[PDB]
């Protein structure tokens, strides 16, 4: 449905506006750098929306004689790439939180907007073309787990951390404090009291991002396998070629079955070609009806069985099919 | 060739090792954060390498009755998505250099490694399956233009900027200096001399990244159009369906031409189906030879022309094709 992706696109725009509003109210330019990062969650909805007005034009057009009945199972692919590509990004970025750990300065406000985002994505998840559903549901599960990360982080971050207490002049041993250490080592004045807070919670986030990454990259892969397999002309999973060939040769009136191509258009519109070699060119229609039946019994319905009638003395050359070109094909 | 992508993969690993070596020698943990960003240039070579040992298995296997002759024109797609996706990343990140501009502390060393990277990518470009070539050449042109950015930046950055001079205690008006302003406003001591350098060169980089992004996103798109078009079963650009149908109906012996599917397997292996409606079921082979000729004259060589022989009184129903199923197909 277009209604669902439309509603969810509207919701994410709402939340980005709320985020810019908080980032400007609090006057914290370090938080306005997520209202530009949700433009990566609006893209996976715009794409699966564009591929909704294209799986309905299922009519033979001079520019595609099957129609765009496939632009569904391509949309999913693009999504399941973007996400996975994007997913590695998180992983890469998680490494930076092990080398130069930053500090979540204002934890009440981050808990606030994180719980708002977690609720809007719980709705975007409870809201949910059979592979666009999957290619977008995974993409909202991603940011939902990201929001659970943000809450469980900024939850035990006001509960535990201590940070610099006496104004702006204290020693932060847990990481290479840029101004505190600079001014404190360039001026030795025996200043006021200090403190030191736990560090077992300074790296309680990148571990959560690594877990979210290993969750998405396993929930996504089977979707990506199925999409690329459909798009590589591969026999579906439910049709065994050797059985089709044994059954075509069992039929009366035929003796050989040349090029036998089977594939999958989209969903369950499976096609099938075959040359064939009848013997008597007058009882052909009964043979073709029988062959269409032995295709219909195997979930394969749109066929094309060209019969190659044998001439005089030419039953010694398969490559010509009795009907061929010259060399290339 | 596998040799070219192998050589280039070896070169990029060499350069990443050189980058970690400099980042550890100089003791500048702000530069080790590019030896993790070149793991995004090794991916587009690993993919177009995996799709090299898969466009050579062009043999009918029970798991694909065309073979993987298409896994070339899919590889390109994945590349031309990754890059474009990745390209938006740059653009997004360029915006951060307009809001909170950072400082290239050590410009001689950055010029050094930037010129080394620019030379290794000039080689990776001069080094260069007809769409993998394009899907990887664009991907090296990307980082080559990135390197030109790094050189022209860190070139007129030692030539112009001034920065803080008298030890570690000066005023930096051009941007919200974190330690200088903090310690200078928390302690009013009438300290030593200061200075102020130009700001027309502090934002001489993100403009270069925006130009590199608008260069890649126009050099990539036509590749992505062609790849997705091949993968959506679309008639090629060189075969006009109306002409094929007019020419099949002009041929003797036939009167109607049912489902006429034409598409593109990969490169130039174009297939074509067609039912057809002959009249006299004894002169069929001549008609089929003529039809194969009027397909061969149009760059379309792998055909399948099923003839539907008319029964008694049934020349009033196209939907049955004289040969059909029941309702669904
Ligand atoms: Zn999102
Ligand atoms: Zn993170
Ligand atoms: Zn690169
Ligand atoms: Zn940049």
Author numbering:
A (entry chain B), B (entry chain A): 7 to 134, 241 to 441
Quote from the publication:
The SLC39A protein family contains 14 members (SLC39A1 through SLC39A14) that transport zinc ions from the extracellular space and organelles into the cytoplasm, while the SLC30A protein family contains ten members (SLC30A1 through SLC30A10) that transport zinc ions from the cytoplasm into the organelles and the extracellular space. The mammalian SLC30A1 gene was cloned in 1995 and subsequently found to be expressed ubiquitously in the plasma membrane. Interestingly, we found that SLC30A1 is localized to the basolateral membrane of the intestine, where it controls zinc efflux from enterocytes into the circulation.
Therefore, we expressed and purified the full‐length human SLC30A1 protein and then resolved the structure at 3.7‐Å resolution using cryo‐EM. The overall structure shows that the SLC30A1 homodimer is relatively compact, with the TM helices in each subunit forming symmetrical helical bundles and TM2, TM3, and TM6 contributing to the formation of the dimer interface. Under basal conditions, we found that each protomer in the SLC30A1 dimer contains four putative zinc‐binding sites (Z1 through Z4) located in the TMD and CTD. The Z1 and Z2 zinc‐binding sites are located in the TMD, possibly forming the zinc transport pathway; in contrast, Z3 and Z4 are located in the CTD, where they likely sense intracellular free zinc ions and form the starting point for zinc transport. Among the four zinc‐binding sites, Z2 is the most conserved, with a zinc ion connecting TM2 and TM5 via four coordinated residues (His43, Asp47, His251, and Asp255). Moreover, a zinc ion in Z3 stabilizes the CTD‐CTD interaction via His408 and His413 in one protomer and Cys437 in the other protomer. Finally, the Z4 site resides in a highly negatively charged cavity comprised of His370, His387, Glu420, and Cys433. We also found that Cys291 in the helical domain in the ECD of each protomer forms a disulfide bond, which stabilizes the dimer conformation and is essential for SLC30A1 function. We, therefore, propose a model for the zinc transport pathway for SLC30A1 based on electrostatic potential and zinc‐binding sites; this model of zinc efflux reflects a novel dimer‐dependent mode of zinc transport that may be unique to SLC30A1 and has not been reported previously for any other cation diffusion facilitators.
